[PDB]
Amino acid sequence: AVKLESENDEYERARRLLAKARSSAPTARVFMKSVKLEWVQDNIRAAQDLCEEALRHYEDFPKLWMMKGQIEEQKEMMEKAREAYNQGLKKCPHSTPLWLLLSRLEEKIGQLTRARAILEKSRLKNPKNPGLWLESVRLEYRAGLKNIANTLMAKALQECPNSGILWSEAIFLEARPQRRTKSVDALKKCEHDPHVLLAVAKLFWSQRKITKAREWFHRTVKIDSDLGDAWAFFYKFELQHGTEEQQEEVRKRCESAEPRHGELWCAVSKDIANWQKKIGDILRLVAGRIKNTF
């Protein structure tokens, strides 16, 4: 009902529906939806009060902890956001929905050595062979030395070798005047498309081979999955290429790609885009999708 009211004749009606839902004694999901609604277009005080109410209701919610950290960082108060992130990580640990955010905040706000230490602690506490190694390499190591980043990528490929993200990070960031086709062939052994076939398409487009790059991008976008980053990259490569009419068709087939396309928002926002900043006014998604992803 709140989602329907968001696209209804009044957004104040959506706020009223969210308040009524909060008055129906709901769980933490509706509480996060209400917090996002207060964080859609309103004062930060309302979002802080909603977060305090959620904490007084239930503190075991990674979405709520991420929302509280983002609210505290919205006012450029990085210390409070960092404290909230640390408290959430200690009280309600997860794999890496917020550890990467904490590492990014530590690298941006303060020295990056603390961020690298936090990344190592996350990779040693509850790794379960995660994809956070790419974050520890791209967001941390790629901004510094190069050989250290290569060694980190090699180690991240030694453990969990079938990871698409790690293989794509190692393929397009090792070297591509040479020793790139070998990496592409090696990654093709672990056949999947967590932006893995998209890496092959990007490598083909780098070599200016329009036909092969177009074929690979079409294969990866049409039927591999409903992703956002791959679809956006394919659209950008089509507009850059000399179609100028197939670009519009690709954009139409991507915006209308499987209207359950929150997966195409589960990859665009997880790789390029964000939530409740420009996505909140994309078409409708301000209240639900902001709390859904992190």
Binding site: Q111, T113, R114, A117, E120, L124, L145, K155
Partner: protein, 359 residues
């Protein structure tokens, strides 16, 4: 048959100096031990509990990469303001504390540097121009470094085989070097000669430790036998029989009566000088223990690190595990404890050295 070498007169004057320096510190340590005994048991227990809580609060404050090759040893400055890291690439690096900013890059070693140690009076009562650091590499050279020069002040030739570990005597006048020729050598800074060439090990001598009083020196060998030598008499006092494999770490507690030796059998054995027996055998790690070090001032805890990518803190005399310092992807090759005891440095084969601080 125990052969006896007629040492030069330099050995005689050096040993008289050692006795005259070590006796007053021996009495001072005895008086301090008495004063500690007069302290009520309740206050001692409260202090021990506070230290245990602080050590359980230990976490990785900083993680810094040292060099493109693995780091072999890390040593703190006497003032806990500087950290020296030795690398297999031949370069030594002096970093600031706690900001971990690279301050100096000592160059001159061409092979794998095994150990670098600060002078005991460095950054406290010694000028930066004087010899403040000693380093040894795989080529056998022993180079002395100041703090104002990235170039070596002098080189100690005399070892044709790789020098394993180098340690300053607590006086700083004498330097002990361990070589794979099965012998260890004490050198003088003032006379620039090898005062004491001491064999006795059947295999190479890896690690050397000095008693805080300066009277005794503990040498661990690859023959799984550790030896305690009285420098004034040149006679081995105790053999630490009981280890199976090569001993990689020997340390003297500041109490001056416990000795901890970690071996390749993954165990660290604590022995008593007074009782002349092993008092405990900690099954420390799942892999070989690289280094063993007590808390420098009071010795309340024992620090171990191994190839299992982990360090561990043990109570004293409790020998119970307090905290398992984990987070190193590579093997912890070297470890050190700050003079104040608040900071713990662990340098690993992952080419990174991590600082641990109490929250």
């Amino acid at each position: 048959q125990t052969w006896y070498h007629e040492g030069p007169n330099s050995l005689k004057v050096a040993r008289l100096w050692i006795a005259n320096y070590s006796l007053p510190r021996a009495m001072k340590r005895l008086e301090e031990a008495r004063l500690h005994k007069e302290i009520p048991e309740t206050t001692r227990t409260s202090q021990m509990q506070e230290l245990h809580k602080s050590l359980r609060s230990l976490n990785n404050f900083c993680s810094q990469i040292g060099d493109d090759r693995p780091i072999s040893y890390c040593h703190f400055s006497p003032n806990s303001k500087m950290l020296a890291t030795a690398c297999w690439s031949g370069l030594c690096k002096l970093w600031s504390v706690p900001d971990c900013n690279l301050l100096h890059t000592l160059r001159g070693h061409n092979t794998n540097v095994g150990a670098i140690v600060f002078h005991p009076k460095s950054t406290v009562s010694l000028d930066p121009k004087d010899v403040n650091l000693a380093s040894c590499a795989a080529d056998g050279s022993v180079k002395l470094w100041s703090l104002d020069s990235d170039e070596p002040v002098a080189d100690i030739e005399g070892h044709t085989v790789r020098v394993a570990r180098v340690m300053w005597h607590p006086s700083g006048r004498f330097l002990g070097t361990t070589c794979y020729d099965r012998s260890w050598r004490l050198w003088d800074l003032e006379a620039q000669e090898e005062i004491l060439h001491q064999e006795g090990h059947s295999m190479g001598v890896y690690d050397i430790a000095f008693h805080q009083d300066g009277s005794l020196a503990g040498t661990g060998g690859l023959d799984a036998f550790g030896r305690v030598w009285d420098l004034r008499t040149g006679r081995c006092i105790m053999f630490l029989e009981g280890h199976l494999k090569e001993i990689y770490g020997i340390n003297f507690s500041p109490n001056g009566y416990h000795i901890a030796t970690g071996s390749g059998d993954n165990t660290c054995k604590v022995w008593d000088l007074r009782q002349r027996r092993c008092v405990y055998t900690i099954p420390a790690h799942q892999n070989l223990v690289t280094g063993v070090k007590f808390e420098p001032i009071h010795g309340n805890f024992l620090l171990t690190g191994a190839y299992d990518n982990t360090a561990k803190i043990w109570t004293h005399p409790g020998w119970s595990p307090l905290k398992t310092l984990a987070g190193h992807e590579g093997k912890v090759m070297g470890l050190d404890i700050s003079s104040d005891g608040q900071l713990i440095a662990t340098c690993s084969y992952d080419r990174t050295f991590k600082l641990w601080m109490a929250e």
